[PDB]
């Protein structure tokens, strides 16, 4: 992975940026050291209480003279401690605000310069850069990668310096307060980073191993879901379900292990930190007994050292964000610093005023930059006199267009020169070069605006009268004036779709507005109907007037009118001259003449569910039984520590027998280790209870999901929201994440209720008023913890929804780059981009202020909490209310328990995302289709007859109930006779075939098979004897024998049936000859096949089941030569003795049909045979006269 140097990345930082960064980091430094100072003042606080305990504990000395030396002493000490706590907090809000504000600010100001300079950099690039680069990743890189460079030069590094200031501040306060104890804890430290390091490598080994493990099942997932139509047709839903399942109990089982190791890792971490507590307290409290360190110092160095150590843990991801940001900026700064060969953005050449118009190509040797191994132009020599129209022909290769592309100087020639008049094309300015050169490309392109605005892109300073005039010159004035909103009518991609000739003529107007002295026409009339070609060419012929024109047309009808015809054979121009010469010489030209004669849309719709999801995992009780008790133990483990922590510092503050200090000390420290051991047990156990659970729940669930997915109707697969990728994504992620909302949530809710629950009872017995204070303060801060991520992600989505405006501009300008560069007008797009960007950048200031005051509001309060609880608590202890040990207990129970529920909440996956991903699963499963392929009801007769009849039957597609397809057409087909379906296009030529295959239910009317209604028949059995052949046949990546035998399921096909169906489809000759026989894989993973052969396989497939009805729907549209003969030759022998329905556009093979039905609109207007419908002189007579 690449990476820019650090110094290089902040290049766009100015005076104010460097100022903001230095001041921000300086605030982050002093903010970072606030917390350790808070621990120092906490130790100096506890030392004051430990003095008041031991005197009032043993016997009785002075009752009236205690209140002056104890009660009055602690008040005087706390009145200062409160000023220290509150002072520090008051500083915290200030420096935090400076920190986040200034950083988010300066970073934003740099990002604003970066995205702009990046966009200009892209526009500045030449077309050769676009040849080697995918535009798709380029367009997304402007949004994703710049937003990614934004993160990591913002608040992230302010928090990095804060975390490091906390590290250094913690170790400095540690060593400053204690020499030995800090060394002891730090001696325990290396065993943690080594443990965290090894366990992070273990699960990440299984994580990357899981991805290519399910990819095997996801392979058959998309293969089926893509081919589903052919699946439901052949009903292999049983076999495809089994095939999908076979790869499931292979992948997830491997995931079980990872789950377990992840829990073991977490348990190891807790064991080790608990061991650190036990050890540090064992040494510290043994150290206070020899009267070296005080009680407060042990707490001070322990807390400052721990905090300083965990500070690294909180500095790791922030520095990570900065790391990939430099990796992201390499690609972007590469494009910016890239200066193109053709600029094209400034003027450095000449701008001739003659401007004359003579074209010359002298010795042009050129090859494309993408493929340099192949040379296109080899010594091209071509001259065009003034105002002369030259046509290029020869059907050589890309070279024709290359000349056009060379002429507007998109590419510079490898050898030789293109000269307009006496000067080279390179000696003249590019912008001015393309202003004097007009171009009309093969595919017309209009931007999404008014017609007028599409014209303005041709030239900006155009008055409305000039626009109209230019439209009238383009014969486009007629239809524009018929448009509803006239010249203000929208066009382009979205809204108001126009026909190709109209779109092209608007473009011609656009080019005519620039008034170029040279006009280039590259396949202008191509890909157009003969009716629009007339008008477009009518405009073009009038656009060639007084201009030097070089024209390329595939259709040679419009070529002859040119002044000079130049032929292309290979890379060199051979024959050049007038029409009569090129006919008389019988060259290439003469040969050509004789031969041519959805993400957001998903999660929004589902309602529900609350705790219904647990029923999905309810298949396994025992795991949950052990899991709840387990989670209760690990949960009640936390209040235990609040007691034992208070008991250690309690033995040194509350006084008591010194001979019992050691005895108790070693008890409680050791106790902590026990407390660690048990915590290791829980995480080992939970991993075997909920850990397996959610995985089993996954496998079974995917199975279930997939089954229901095949149960679904075809109309459900037509729903735009359910795509093969969306279904495979639903199946891959949402199904597996459901476990986040089942057992994990019970674990979280039980560890939480055990912790804060039992802890609150304990703190309620040992404290009354203080407990009531903390259960007030804590929830208030918790809500602040919620609002923090509410206003953070809330204004984050708002910032993106206001950036989609620019994203549209840059997207449209990049996707059509090859078009805009021909019209210049790049700088115009830059202008529109900056104008679009000015709005979100004006909100960046307010953004920073809001983020600042919010971060400071969450953080400031935190210190003030301490300041409240300890002031009020000291007020409690100073009086008859006891004691201090219980103050510290209540505090540690409620507060550390509150943080503990936060950690537990951060363990489990996102419950919201889990429930929403769950709802899609429960809905996909409980989804009952109209037509059910799984039903075991139905008639199942003996009668092999097979008479097809459509009576009434009016249908319209459920996806788009606009313009019904069948308006009640009726027909009939008896056994052995073949039906023929004729019409202008599809709907409902193919809808008949789909309806007989029962993919849909018509709204009114009925379709009968024999004497029975179809709806009465068994669903699967109906399709059991229906042969279906589509326009593009598909095979499964299994094998050939399986493909052929895929025709008939629920039966052993064996060698005999496959060879028997092979020999009649005439495919047996292609099998033995190609190594090897039947074992070969089709396709794309095996040996490729031509359309004809694969189609013959598709025939053999539908022929195995011995169907009494064949449905042939536009069978071979792409088949050519003699390949089409043998296919239909194999169809004709298998059509005898069967009911057949043929849809073809050929109309040549329909003449032999028994019945020919012409279907127009929604009904049947013509019925009869070929000669019968021919002698009728109806619409069939109009359609069959185009055969000549
Ligand atoms: Hg920011
Ligand atoms: Hg080309
Ligand atoms: Hg547990
Ligand atoms: Hg379609
Ligand atoms: Hg259709
Ligand atoms: Hg297969
Ligand atoms: Hg047929």
Curated annotation (Swiss-Prot):
Q: Which Gene Ontology BP annotations are present?
A: cellular hyperosmotic salinity response; cellular response to alkaloid; cellular response to antibiotic; cellular response to borneol; cellular response to dexamethasone stimulus; cellular response to estradiol stimulus; cellular response to external biotic stimulus; cellular response to L-glutamate
Q: How is its activity regulated?
A: Translocase activity is inhibited by verapamil and is sensitive to energy depletion. C1orf115 regulates drug efflux through modulation of ABCB1 localization and activity.
Query: Where does the chain cross the membrane?
Result: 15-37, 84-104, 154-175, 183-203, 262-283, 298-319, 625-645, 670-690, 746-766, 768-787, 848-870, 887-908
User: Any miscellaneous information on file?
Assistant: In mouse the MDR gene family includes three or more related but distinct cellular genes.
The reaction(s) this protein catalyses: ATP + H2O + xenobioticSide 1 = ADP + phosphate + xenobioticSide 2; ATP + H2O + phospholipidSide 1 = ADP + phosphate + phospholipidSide 2; a 1,2-diacyl-sn-glycero-3-phosphoethanolamine(in) + ATP + H2O = a 1,2-diacyl-sn-glycero-3-phosphoethanolamine(out) + ADP + phosphate + H(+); a 1,2-diacyl-sn-glycero-3-phosphocholine(out) + ATP + H2O = a 1,2-diacyl-sn-glycero-3-phosphocholine(in) + ADP + phosphate + H(+)
The species this protein belongs to is Mus musculus (Mouse)
- Cross-referenced InterPro entries: AAA+_ATPase, ABC1_TM_dom, ABC1_TM_sf, ABC_transporter-like_ATP-bd, ABC_transporter-like_CS, P-loop_NTPase, Type_1_exporter
Q: Which gene encodes it?
A: Abcb1a
Q: Known SMART domains for this protein?
A: AAA (SM00382)
Q: Where does ATP 1 bind?
A: 394-401
Q: Which UniProt keywords apply?
A: ATP-binding, Cell membrane, Cytoplasm, Glycoprotein, Membrane, Nucleotide-binding, Phosphoprotein, Repeat, Translocase, Transmembrane, Transmembrane helix, Transport
State where ATP 2 binds.
Answer: 983-990
Say what the protein does.
Answer: Translocates drugs and phospholipids across the membrane. Catalyzes the flop of phospholipids from the cytoplasmic to the exoplasmic leaflet of the apical membrane. Participates mainly to the flop of phosphatidylcholine, phosphatidylethanolamine, beta-D-glucosylceramides and sphingomyelins. Energy-dependent efflux pump responsible for decreased drug accumulation in multidrug-resistant cells.
Residue positions with a glycan: 54, 58, 61
Write down what this protein is called. Answer: ATP-dependent translocase ABCB1
Cellular compartments annotated: Cell membrane; Apical cell membrane; Cytoplasm
């Amino acid at each position: 992975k690449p990476a820019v140097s650090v110094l290089t990345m902040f290049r766009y930082a100015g005076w104010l940026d460097r100022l903001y960064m230095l001041v921000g980091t300086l605030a982050a430094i002093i903010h970072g050291v606030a917390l350790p100072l808070m621990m120092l003042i906490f130790g100096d606080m506890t030392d004051s209480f430990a003095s008041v305990g031991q005197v009032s504990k043993q016997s009785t000395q002075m009752s009236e003279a205690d209140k002056r030396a104890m009660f009055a002493k602690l008040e005087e000490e706390m009145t200062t401690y409160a000023y220290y706590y509150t002072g520090i907090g008051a500083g915290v809000l200030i420096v935090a605000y400076i920190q986040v504000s200034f950083w988010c600010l300066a970073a934003g100001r740099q990002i604003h310069k970066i995205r702009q300079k990046f966009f200009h950099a892209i526009m500045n690039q030449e077309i050769g850069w676009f040849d080697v680069h995918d535009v798709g990743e380029l367009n997304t890189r402007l949004t994703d990668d710049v937003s990614k460079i934004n993160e990591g030069i913002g608040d992230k590094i302010g928090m990095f310096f804060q975390a490091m200031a906390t590290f250094f501040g913690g170790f400095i306060i540690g060593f400053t307060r204690g020499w030995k104890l800090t060394l002891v804890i730090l001696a325990i430290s290396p065993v943690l980073g080594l443990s965290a390091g090894i366990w992070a490598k273990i699960l990440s080994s299984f994580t990357d191993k899981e991805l290519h493990a399910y990819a095997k099942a996801g392979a058959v997932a998309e293969e089926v879901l893509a081919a589903i139509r052919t699946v439901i047709a052949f009903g292999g839903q049983k076999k495809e379900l089994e095939r999908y399942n076979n790869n499931l109990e292979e992948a997830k089982r491997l995931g079980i292990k990872k789950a377990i190791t992840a829990n073991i890792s977490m348990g190891a971490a807790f064991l080790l930190i608990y061991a650190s507590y036990a050890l540090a307290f064992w040494y510290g409290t043994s150290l206070v007994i020899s009267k070296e360190y005080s009680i407060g110092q042990v707490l001070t160095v322990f807390f400052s050292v721990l905090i300083g150590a965990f500070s690294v843990g909180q500095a790791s991801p922030n520095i990570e964000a900065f790391a990939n940001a430099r990796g992201a900026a390499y690609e972007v700064f590469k494009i910016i610093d890239n200066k193109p060969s053709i600029d094209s953005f400034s003027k450095s050449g000449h701008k001739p005023d003659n401007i004359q118009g003579n074209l010359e190509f002298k010795n042009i040797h050129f090859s494309y930059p993408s493929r340099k191994e192949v040379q296109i132009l080899k010594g091209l020599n071509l001259k065009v006199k003034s105002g002369q129209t030259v046509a290029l022909v020869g059907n050589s290769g890309c070279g024709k267009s290359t000349t056009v592309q060379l002429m507007q100087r998109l590419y510079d020639p490898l050898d030789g020169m293109v000269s307009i008049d006496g000067q080279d094309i390179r000696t003249i300015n590019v912008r001015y070069l393309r202003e004097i050169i007009g171009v009309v490309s093969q595919e017309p392109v209009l931007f999404a605006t008014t017609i007028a605005e599409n014209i303005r892109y041709g030239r900006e300073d155009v008055t409305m009268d000039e626009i109209e005039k230019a439209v009238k010159e383009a014969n486009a004035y007629d239809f524009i004036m018929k448009l509803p909103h006239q010249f203000d009518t929208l066009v382009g991609e979205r809204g108001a779709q126009l026909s190709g000739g109209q779109k092209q003529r608007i473009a011609i107007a656009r080019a005519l507005v620039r008034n170029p002295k040279i006009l280039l026409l590259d396949e202008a009339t191509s890909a157009l109907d003969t009716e629009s070609e007339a008008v477009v060419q009518a405009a073009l012929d009038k656009a060639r007037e007084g201009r030097t024109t070089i024209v390329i047309a595939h259709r040679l009808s419009t070529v002859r009118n040119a002044d000079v015809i130049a032929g292309f054979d290979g890379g060199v121009i051979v024959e050049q001259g007038n029409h009569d010469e090129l006919m008389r010489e019988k060259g290439i030209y003469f040969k050509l003449v004789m031969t041519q004669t959805k993400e957001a849309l998903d999660e929004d719709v589902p309602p529900a569910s609350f705790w219904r999801i647990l029923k999905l995992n309810s298949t396994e009780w025992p795991y949950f039984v052990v899991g709840i008790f387990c989670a209760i133990i690990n949960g009640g483990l936390q209040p235990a520590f609040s007691v034992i922590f208070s008991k250690v510092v309690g033995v040194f503050t509350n006084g008591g027998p010194p001979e019992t200090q050691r005895q108790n000390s070693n008890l409680f420290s050791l106790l902590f280790l026990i407390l660690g051991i048990i915590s290791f047990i829980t995480f080992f156990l939970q991993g075997f209870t909920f850990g397996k659970a959610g995985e089993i729940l996954t496998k079974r669930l995917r199975y279930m999901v997939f089954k229901s997915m095949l149960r679904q109707d075809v109309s459900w697969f037509d729903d735009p929201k359910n795509t093969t990728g969306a279904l495979t994504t639903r199946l891959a992620n949402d199904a597996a994440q459901v476990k986040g909302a089942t057992g994990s949530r019970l674990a979280v809710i039980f560890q939480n209720i055990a912790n804060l629950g039992t802890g609150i009872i304990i703190s309620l017995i040992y404290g009354w008023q203080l407990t009531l204070l903390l259960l007030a303060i804590v929830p208030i801060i918790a809500i602040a913890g919620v609002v923090e991520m509410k206003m953070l992600s809330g204004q984050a989505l708002k910032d993106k929804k206001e950036l989609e405006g620019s994203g549209k501009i840059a997207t449209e300008a990049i996707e059509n780059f090859r078009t805009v560069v021909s019209l210049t007008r790049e700088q115009k797009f830059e202008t529109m981009y900056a104008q679009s960007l000015q709005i979100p950048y004006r909100n960046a200031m307010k953004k920073a202020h809001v983020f600042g005051i919010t971060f400071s509001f969450t953080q400031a309060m935190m210190y003030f909490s301490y300041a409240a609880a300890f002031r009020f608590g000291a007020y409690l202890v100073t009086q008859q209310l006891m004691t201090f040990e219980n103050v510290l207990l209540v505090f540690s129970a409620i507060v550390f328990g509150a943080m503990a529920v936060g950690q537990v909440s951060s363990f489990a996956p996102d419950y919201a995302k889990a429930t929403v991903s769950a709802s899609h699963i429960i809905r996909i499963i409980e989804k009952t289709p109209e037509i059910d392929s799984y039903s075991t009801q139905g008639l199942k007769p003996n009668m092999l007859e097979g008479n097809v009849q459509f009576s009434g039957v009016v249908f319209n597609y459920p996806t788009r109930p606009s313009i019904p397809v069948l308006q009640g057409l009726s027909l009939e087909v008896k056994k052995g006779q073949t039906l023929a379906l004729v019409g202008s296009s599809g709907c409902g030529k193919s809808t008949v075939v789909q309806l007989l295959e029962r993919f849909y239910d018509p709204m009114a009317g009925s379709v009968f098979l024999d004497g029975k209604e179809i709806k009465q028949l068994n669903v699967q059995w109906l399709r059991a004897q229906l042969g279906i052949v589509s326009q593009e046949p598909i095979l499964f990546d299994c094998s050939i024998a399986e493909n052929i035998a895929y025709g008939d399921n629920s039966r052993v096909v064996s060698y005999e049936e496959i060879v028997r169906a092979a020999k009649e489809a005439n495919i047996h000759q292609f099998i033995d000859s190609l190594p090897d026989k039947y074992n070969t894989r089709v396709g794309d993973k095996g040996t490729q096949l031509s359309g004809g052969q694969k189609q013959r396989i598709a025939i053999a497939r539908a022929l195995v089941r011995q169907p009494h009805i064949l449905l042939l729907d536009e069978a071979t549209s792409a088949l050519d030569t003699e390949s089409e003969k043998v296919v239909q030759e194999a169809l004709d022998k298998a059509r005898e003795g069967r009911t057949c329905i043929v849809i073809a556009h050929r109309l040549s093979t329909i003449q032999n049909a028994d019945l020919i039905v012409v279907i127009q609109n929604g009904k049947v207007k013509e019925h009869g045979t070929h000669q019968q419908l021919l002698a009728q002189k109806g619409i069939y007579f109009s359609m069959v006269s185009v055969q000549a």
